[PDB]
From Swiss-Prot:
It comes from the Eukaryota. Its EC number is 1.18.1.2. It is a peripheral membrane protein. This is Ferredoxin--NADP reductase, leaf isozyme, chloroplastic.
Amino acid sequence: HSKKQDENIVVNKFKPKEPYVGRCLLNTKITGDDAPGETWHMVFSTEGEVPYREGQSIGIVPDGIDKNGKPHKLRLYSIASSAIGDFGDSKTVSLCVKRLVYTNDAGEVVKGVCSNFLCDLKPGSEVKITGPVGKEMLMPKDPNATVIMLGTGTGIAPFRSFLWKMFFEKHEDYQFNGLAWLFLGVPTSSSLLYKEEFEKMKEKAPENFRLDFAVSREQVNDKGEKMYIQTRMAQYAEELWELLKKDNTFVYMMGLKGMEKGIDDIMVSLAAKDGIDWIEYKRTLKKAEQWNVEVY
Ligand SMILES: Cc1cc2nc3c(=O)[nH]c(=O)nc-3n(C[C@H](O)[C@H](O)[C@H](O)COP(=O)(O)OP(=O)(O)OC[C@H]3O[C@@H](n4cnc5c(N)ncnc54)[C@H](O)[C@@H]3O)c2cc1C
């Protein structure tokens, strides 16, 4: 008796020791040439073998030998494409991959293994695919639900997956009639992911979809404070808190680790004005499958 779409769920069909070998079809940088770090959108072939659904992850074993001599362990990535995929043929999986580059304490420029592998993939090359993994971030069964989605960076990926099923696809058993509300936080305009796709959705279903961005380096609120995802949210505080009281409202959070801090801070103020301690109210939201977080 789960409140999420988990009928016939598949988990761990393919194992890291023996993964499904797909091929790269397309691989495209989807950030501007000026953004802080490039993100690539990529489409793999699965010939229908990898039966996922909105909100799951595939794992990726990257080609190569570690500093010791034995194969790399997998890195999980959220599925950017919806169940039926970007081609609608149900034979593809897509990823949204931030290329990881930082400079370490010692002055060296260090490239993350699995993300740089994916971002250097050419169409034709083989990719080792494991999974699908995850049961937390599945859509609500309820088609008249409210589905507030908070996301930073590559954390937009499951939400693209979500929304494609809702607004870009016809299904004889799922017709979304609730409210879908995306909040996407990024540094620059050039860091904006799938903007066009989301814009298109907003105009196709203006009743059911609401879309707010948060560009910290270019945007500012009344108090001149930088526009983080919680800063944007703060503008619709009284309203989001009102939806949360409703027992058919599902919140999803996905993106970099740091993002969960700011949102909580604002929820404290919001909850305090009602006379309710947030940090504890969230625990009832968790139990009820309504506050769903997953950060990395
Ligand atoms: C459920 C889930 C979903 C995910 N979805 C996505 C996704 O959709 N898109 C995406 O791009 N990633 C996603 N990730 C994160 C993904 O695991 C990373 O891309 C991956 O860890 C990158 O590792 P790498 O192999 O590129 O680098 P690695 O070789 O794994 O290097 C990582 C190590 O470097 C260190 N490190 C990390 N950051 C820094 C830093 N800034 N400065 C110094 N040291 C650092 C840490 O010790 C870390 O363990 C997801 C992770 C999880 C758990």
